[PDB]
């Protein structure tokens, strides 16, 4: 029995910072796991080293599910969606990274086999609501010529406090990259809640006309059921789940209309969470598509996770700024003729340069 | 890493026979699976032996999830419901064995660690329709001085090409097995798809009265509609879910109103399927409860699964004549304390007799 | 009083191997079945052997539904769907055609007469995800020479375990047969599981501007829920219920938002579960449409069931490899003019060469 | 018009830590608020820190509404239910307090005037799982002797992990209880949580036979659907909204089959939210009685909010051990002949021993 000897929480400067917990178990292997780094994942850090960390310390790495589990009904007044969640998720990751080690397996390997350990990628870009027209082409151009994509998603990240901003100059920007891209090209389109239910509606006929494929988070996340109005009211699919952080949510989403999820791996239930949620998709019949934007640790536990999808429908996000991966990871997220190239070393596969690590780690501590 | 290199399918007389999956990998070790035994489930062996068996052998024993789930796509026009989904289950069964016998662990420790290891079990005692009241009475007697289950649950079994046979006489037959457990103990009623709606309901209201637990298949499984009718109209709580054998007939059965689903781990997914369905029902926020007849393979895959269950409610079922474990099984489910008690054995745990087995075992093979 | 003196589950290789019941009365006279031979019906026919044939021998040929109807309540724990209701279907359908020998009438004469005996078929024609454009136009044309159908539809046969696979090549497909076919030509497309909701939506909407009248199974059969929101979402006709075997989960089809359904007289009901699928269809207000692929027993279970059929809105299917009704039958399903001749010989009216037969049946025997 | 000067975010020993933010504007007056003590409030103290502060620091007081709007839409990607919310919530109270200090009036005169300025409250009694019946019993006789309440709550603070864990022992509780206050007394029953939608409806209807007024978070709160059926199911009123932390998420709970709605003033919203709360609570024609633990700050906002809500059906909730609130507060929740007594200080009206906060403080700062 591998026990939990510790349980470090380490917020690392990258290539920006990222929040990595690192777990070591009595004979000194380790295992790897991230929290989404919203304001730098320094809450679900603390988190980590307050409440987690002591309890996990002088458990059993394979009691992972039941120890975890335990661990969120005591931090649930805590939320736990968001920050409680990704410090749980991270925790997830690295025990599953510390099982595959121990087991001498790749996790897919534990997880009952992969379909396919070559997975295509698409160019998820960000920023747009601020560029023109022609840097937006720009910027798709650039990134497709790198990436050789299957698909590629164009992003707002616009202020959240501002409704139905500039519709017109949406669309023209959707127009655009339609005529960069040509006819065929697999586009989609994240309206980073945007818009309200007649301006997302206004827009996804747009999309529509424009031969989108798909239409990400149009309304306020908060607003599941009008997201789900959205998704009916649409021909074009309607996607949304990033901001979606437990199973039963998961499942309200899908019964108020919506057919295509996308919860996160670093966001919520880390490789354990995620299989749960794939079942849920299966379950009800609608595409299980996850978000994922880092180019390291998380992106190597959604890469197992979905080796194992049967119905895989869209290719993997490969976010802005993978290159931020170097130097920390040796191997982090990088595409080859368009497609992510999984293997078989056990656990995660993930490959950390120790020396640069700690020339960029702070460790979070009980304060 | 490890190939499959034999898959055989097993006709075992026991104690009426058991339908069980050996598959052995290409270092010798040895996976035991099991298939609900419906008419012998010989028609489910038949389709291991055809179907099953040719495309397993040779491949990996770690690509479980992925070789079943193709080989359900393959076989998806014979059902699968039944036959087909059993016949997987065997399957599963088996490789998760030789999966924890490779690795080194228990399959509990293969799915994330344990909430219990001593499960309490149910007293399910069937065969009610064509007793008398006193006979009802003493069976419930024998069973609970052998067994001091945490519940009793009561089955019918009776005729399905008839209904609301005698609405009376059950109802009688409840009271009387109230009086003799007492104001305070767990029972269930197994209607075994007797009654109509209204039939349903009217028992239902007995029940209540009567302060039983829950209430199970109330009506015709293939009357899904009407199966969540009636859950939403009762307070007793009413399960049904033994005949559903996919994942998605699950969620239809919860979306129609049941709020306690009991599918069966050798009827359907084995153990991969079994921790989907768990999952589900934990997003819906229903009770599962597994309903489970055998005494050795089927039993321990069940516990193992049922072990990793946070929100456990009910007891671990224990039908009629579990003695029949012995002597193919050395080490067959048996309650001591009220509780299975769940062990560390690598895979399944389960320990076979090979040579009363060798006596008892024909093997169903292409063109028998 | 006509008793059932043995029943025998026959495996035969035809023109690939078929799945045929024969029920041979007391008097000698013999009644032919069918089971839908899914993996050559290997498994229905060892349950006919092992728990249908013990059963029916000894008993009464008018009893027919009765006695199938408790044997499916006897089956019930073997799903009963797919192997259970193919081999029940199967014994129906013999009990039936010695029904109609014993009573000197045709089965559409004991069924409450014929609307019409002339029916129309259509082509039927599978493989079209394994071919090229210009090979799924070839096979299109060199059917429809021959033929004279009053309708075409083109089904994909894809690998199931894959989800939306090629939408672009799929829709490149339907346009050119389009193309082939003239703008008046009635055409289906048989998606066969292929589509997410999202990419049945999309298909959809594309075999809606090319003027297809029906879109068949677009999603996983299992999917009912889905089924049925992409029926409501579409105006193009979505059909299902090939994969449906009872008539409680016909019913469920029907509510869930189906407006034609397609169950088979060979995998499910025969004769008996047939006209009682048709009333359900006819209290529903949806089209009936069964699926057939079998050009014998099959095919005439399925005409005289469908000359019943007063809101006849589809045509007869007339699937590949037709030929191979031969030379085990001497009058099995066959074209003139576009239409299949019923005719008013006792029972099915099926002719079978007992001595082909013979030399290519193997019997299932107790085992 | 007055400006932010310095957000401090404070740790507190009571009397167990609370955890408050004070807020100095330029003319140096102080405005207090409070969030919910969530494992110590200490992650949500560390959001009021790195990143709430920096941003509020320079700012209009008066500009509260926009000013928190703005931040929980840069902080939405932390959840923002619980932590975020919380944190949020503790700096609207703050601000409501110096808005009022700087204009001159009680809250409550800001929000339009109160229906009343006693308001009756009801005994909130915890950790009865642990309990035996005996042990209840004299709980709720000392509270009820001490406190002579409108109104008692006894609740669960069962182990989440676990479910319908002990049915009957709790129906006998809930009736010893009964026995005790008489036929007439309000009680309410609080099963944090801790059944299954079958066991809710079990507890559900024994409580409907003992009179019982309310039947709080029968389920896990994490199970929407199931809350608002098992409250559309029953005819006791379920009541759920306490670990409800956004106002769409309030109009999902009621839209589900919710009745009665308990968002609480320090884990959301603050008094801007609440308000808005209170508005949907009215829209939708549900009860809104919101939970509160806090002796002091959150007490006294809860309070202001609550003499503004013209329906008000049920009592102030008064929980254990709440004699805490000082020495750290000089006018803490106490209640008088049954009653709180509103009071018109500008702003909250809650007095703080600078003395005291001194020596007892913790200030959670960047980097600590
Ligand atoms: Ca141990
Ligand atoms: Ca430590
Ligand atoms: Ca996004
Ligand atoms: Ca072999
Ligand atoms: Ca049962
Ligand atoms: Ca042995
Ligand atoms: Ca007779
Ligand atoms: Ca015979
Ligand atoms: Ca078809
Ligand atoms: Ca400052
Ligand atoms: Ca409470
Ligand atoms: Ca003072
Ligand atoms: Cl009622």
Same mark, same amino acid.
């Given at each position: 029995?591998?026990?939990?000897?510790?349980?470090?929480?380490?917020?690392? $400067?990258?290539?920006?910072?990222?929040?990595?917990?690192?777990?070591?178990?009595?004979?000194?292997?380790?295992?790897?796991?991230?929290?989404?780094?919203?304001?730098?994942?320094?809450?679900?850090?603390?988190?980590?080293?307050?409440?987690?960390?002591?309890?996990?310390?002088?458990?059993?790495?394979?009691?992972? =599910?039941?120890?975890?589990?335990?661990?969120?009904?005591?931090?649930?007044?805590?939320?736990?969606?968001?920050?409680?969640?990704?410090?749980?998720?991270?925790?997830?990751?690295?025990?599953?990274?510390?099982?595959?080690?121990?087991?001498?397996?790749?996790?897919?390997?534990?997880?009952?086999?992969? %379909?396919?350990?070559?997975?295509?990628?698409?160019?998820?870009?960000?920023?747009?609501? $601020?560029?023109?027209?022609?840097?937006?082409?720009?910027?798709?151009?650039?990134?497709?010529? =790198?990436?050789?994509?299957?698909?590629?998603?164009?992003? %707002?990240?616009?202020?959240? &406090?501002?409704?139905?901003?500039?519709?017109?100059?949406?669309?023209?920007? =959707?127009?655009?990259?339609?005529?960069?891209?040509?006819?065929?090209?697999?586009?989609?389109?994240?309206? #980073?809640?945007?818009?309200?239910?007649?301006?997302?509606?206004?827009?996804?006929?747009?999309?529509?006309?424009?031969?989108?494929? %798909?239409?990400?988070?149009?309304?306020?996340?908060?607003?599941?059921?009008?997201?789900?109005?959205?998704?009916?009211?649409?021909?074009?699919?309607?996607?949304?789940?990033?901001?979606?952080?437990?199973?039963? =949510?998961?499942?309200?989403?899908?019964?108020?209309?919506?057919?295509?999820?996308?919860?996160?791996?670093?966001?919520?239930?880390?490789?354990?969470?995620?299989?749960?949620?794939?079942?849920?998709?299966? $379950?009800?019949?609608?595409?299980?598509?996850?978000?994922?934007?880092?180019?390291?640790?998380?992106?190597?536990? #959604?890469?197992?996770?979905?080796?194992?999808?049967?119905?895989? &429908?869209?290719?993997?996000?490969?976010?802005?700024? %993978?290159?931020?991966?170097?130097?920390?990871?040796?191997?982090?997220?990088?595409?080859?003729?368009?497609?992510?190239?999984?293997?078989?070393?056990?656990?995660?596969?993930?490959?950390?340069?120790?020396?640069?690590?700690?020339?960029?780690?702070?460790?979070?501590?009980?304060?």
């Amino acid at each position: 029995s591998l026990k939990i000897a510790k349980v470090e929480a380490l917020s690392v $400067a990258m290539g920006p910072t990222s929040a990595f917990v690192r777990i070591t178990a009595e004979d000194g292997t380790v295992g790897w796991g991230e929290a989404s780094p919203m304001l730098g994942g320094i809450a679900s850090l603390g988190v980590v080293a307050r409440d987690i960390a002591p309890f996990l310390e002088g458990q059993e790495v394979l009691d992972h =599910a039941v120890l975890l589990d335990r661990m969120m009904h005591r931090l649930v007044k805590l939320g736990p969606e968001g920050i409680a969640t990704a410090a749980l998720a991270a925790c997830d990751i690295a025990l599953w990274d510390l099982k595959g080690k121990l087991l001498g397996q790749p996790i897919y390997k534990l997880l009952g086999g992969a %379909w396919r350990t070559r997975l295509p990628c698409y160019s998820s870009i960000g920023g747009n609501a $601020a560029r023109s027209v022609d840097e937006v082409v720009r910027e798709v151009a650039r990134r497709v010529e =790198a990436e050789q994509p299957a698909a590629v998603k164009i992003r %707002w990240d616009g202020d959240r &406090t501002r409704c139905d901003v500039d519709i017109p100059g949406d669309i023209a920007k =959707a127009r655009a990259v339609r005529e960069l891209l040509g006819p065929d090209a697999v586009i989609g389109f994240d309206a #980073n809640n945007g818009y309200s239910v007649g301006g997302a509606i206004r827009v996804g006929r747009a999309l529509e006309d424009l031969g989108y494929s %798909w239409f990400e988070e149009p309304v306020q996340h908060y607003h599941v059921g009008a997201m789900g109005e959205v998704a009916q009211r649409l021909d074009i699919t309607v996607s949304a789940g990033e901001q979606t952080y437990t199973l039963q =949510a998961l499942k309200d989403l899908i019964l108020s209309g919506v057919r295509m999820v996308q919860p996160d791996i670093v966001k919520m239930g880390g490789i354990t969470g995620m299989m749960q949620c794939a079942a849920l998709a299966h $379950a009800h019949g609608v595409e299980f598509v996850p978000h994922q934007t880092q180019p390291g640790v998380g992106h190597f536990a #959604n890469i197992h996770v979905l080796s194992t999808l049967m119905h895989m &429908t869209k290719p993997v996000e490969l976010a802005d700024r %993978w290159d931020r991966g170097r130097p920390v990871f040796r191997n982090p997220a990088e595409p080859v003729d368009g497609h992510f190239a999984l293997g078989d070393a056990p656990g995660l596969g993930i490959v950390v340069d120790e020396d640069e690590l700690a020339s960029r780690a702070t460790e979070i501590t009980v304060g």
